[PDB]
Write a protein that binds this ligand. Structure first.
Ligand code: PRO
Ligand code: PRO
Ligand code: PRO
Lengths: 505, 24
């Protein structure tokens, strides 16, 4: 009464144009109602007749109806199983080379459903050469079509390094960036930013996205009302920012990031801090710009607000470290940290339950802050010296014993470096000396690491300008290691070594 | 196209319209 399936299957399996043509229309109509659709599926003979004729037909009207049938079947989880087993995936991929627009939509949407809720559909699309076809079709201009196409690429690229490389080889990066700076349809931009996000953790795709103009193209959508689009852009930008220290025209992006620091959302702030840290690292220009738009003030605020969330402070402290040295306004930034009540919270971050990455970052910042004479006293009063010395004592004793992320040598250099700058102040020199550090500093002259030698000879040089300290350095037998260091290939090491041997007369 | 093929065509087109009366 309601199931005349075997009759229609035989009619689709005919060596005639108009017979196959007319039957495909009537089958397409049965899939439109959510009751007779269950009859088309669960019948393997019927679904195979469709897959065959769709891949074989030469009429325009027939290719649309057959493809729409599978599209209608793919909405139900038991339809996807029929299309997969019927061998529809290899046919639909060949159908991506179709000249007519309307059919492509049906083909791509069906493959999209298969990729989402059918086991093994990802593999089968890859092997049928679906990737190359999907990338090459990124030059189309229908926004709904492109949204499904980019999502297909995201599903196929996610957690699959081989696919990311093929997308790269087929000029994927450039095409996806182009979408970001042209189209403004939210759903397309979202799925497109999700593809780029997946691609951005690939070490070969990453530079390609950067070189195509990805950083800026992603920066365009950060003030956009859509939150899921903004977040995905941020995530991608973070992955990319370590390979972006050369890119120019960054002013707009840098300004927007400083503003995004004031956001209520942790994910937004975390990313903003991270991207800034990476872009301010060793790039002279970005350091200047970020300071000009109130980067210090926003970052201190960020750290103060963040508390003990190390995901926020670690990149924010790193950015602060970058901004407090080696640019025209570095002194200004050093003062600004103090003037925005940042010094106490900075010193606090040297104490537990802080982990090693944050401590390394915090130490390097204090080193920079201590370059400004007006920071000498407050850093002393907050207790930076005794804590730095404790990190130094413990890290050194870990080097002798024959842990997480960073090596203790980096901590040894960091603290001694920090103390070398602090020892510029006479009152700091007293505190440093009173903590029995002279013995440790002398032993540090024996270090194979030249950077440790330099900061060790540096702090000792600073301390040796006082008579009482000079005697202690001599008493610890520093003469022998210092005279060795007079001949170092490192001029800094040799200069300080001379200055200490000078003062011990 | 042939004598018998055109008979096959029209008898196949009639079957489509016969099932259309069955459902609706
Ligand atoms: O065809 C391929 O390469 C994918 C990889 C994971 C499973 N199948
Ligand atoms: O790129 C275009 O032409 C339009 C702009 C909005 C979405 N697509
Ligand atoms: O605070 C410290 O010295 C280190 C940090 C991780 C565990 N103990």
């Amino acid at each position: 009464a309601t199931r005349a399936i075997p009759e229609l299957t035989k009619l689709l399996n005919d060596e005639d144009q108009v017979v196959v043509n007319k039957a495909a229309v009537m089958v397409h109509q049965l899939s439109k109602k959510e009751a007779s659709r269950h009859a088309i599926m669960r019948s393997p003979q019927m679904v195979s007749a469709i897959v065959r004729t769709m891949q074989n037909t030469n009429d325009v009207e027939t290719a649309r109806c057959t493809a729409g049938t599978l599209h209608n079947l793919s909405h139900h989880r038991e339809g996807l199983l029929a299309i997969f087993k019927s061998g529809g995936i290899p046919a639909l991929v060949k159908m991506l080379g179709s000249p007519v627009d309307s059919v492509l939509f049906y083909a791509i949407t069906t493959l999209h459903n298969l990729l989402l809720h059918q086991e093994g559909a990802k593999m089968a699309v890859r092997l049928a050469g679906g990737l190359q076809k999907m990338v090459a079709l990124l030059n189309k201009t229908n926004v709904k079509f492109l949204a499904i196409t980019t999502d297909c690429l995201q599903i196929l690229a996610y957690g699959n390094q081989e696919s990311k490389l093929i997308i790269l080889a087929s000029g994927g990066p450039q095409a996806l960036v182009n979408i970001m700076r042209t189209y403004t349809y939210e759903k397309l931009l979202w799925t497109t930013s999700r593809v780029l996000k997946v691609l951005s953790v690939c070490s070969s795709n990453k530079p390609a996205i950067v070189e195509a103009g990805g950083m800026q193209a992603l920066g365009l959508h950060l003030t956009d009302p859509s939150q899921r689009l903004v977040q995905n852009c941020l995530w991608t930008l973070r992955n990319l920012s370590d390979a972006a220290t050369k890119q120019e025209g960054m002013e707009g992006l840098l300004g927007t990031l400083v503003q995004l620091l004031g956001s209520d959302d942790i994910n937004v702030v975390t990313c903003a801090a991270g991207i800034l840290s990476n872009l301010t690292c060793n790039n002279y220009k970005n350091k200047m710009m970020v300071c000009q738009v109130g980067g210090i003030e926003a970052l201190v605020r960020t750290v103060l607000r963040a508390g003990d969330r190390e995901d926020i402070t670690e990149p924010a402290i790193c950015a602060l470290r970058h901004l407090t040295s080696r640019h025209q306004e570095a002194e200004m930034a050093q003062n600004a940290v103090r003037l925005h009540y940042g010094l106490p919270v900075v010193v606090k971050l040297l104490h537990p339950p802080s982990h090693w990455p944050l401590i390394k970052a915090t130490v390097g910042l204090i080193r920079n802050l201590a370059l400004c004479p007006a920071n000498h006293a407050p850093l002393r009063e907050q207790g930076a010296i005794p804590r730095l010395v404790q990190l130094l004592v413990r890290a050194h004793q870990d080097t002798q014993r024959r842990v997480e992320g960073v090596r203790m040598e980096e901590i040894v250099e960091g603290c001694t470096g920090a103390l070398h700058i602090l020892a510029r102040d006479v009152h700091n020199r007293i505190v440093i000396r009173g903590l029995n550090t002279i013995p440790l500093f002398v032993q540090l002259l024996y270090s194979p690491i030249e950077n440790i030698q330099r900061v060790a000879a540096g702090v000792l040089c600073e301390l040796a300008q006082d008579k009482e300290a000079a005697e202690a350095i001599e008493a610890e037998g520093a003469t022998a290691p210092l005279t060795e260091l007079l001949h170092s290939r490192n001029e800094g090491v040799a200069t300080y070594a001379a200055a200490v041997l000078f003062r011990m007369s | 196209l042939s004598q018998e093929q055109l008979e096959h065509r029209e008898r196949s087109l009639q079957t489509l319209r016969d099932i259309q009366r069955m459902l609706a």
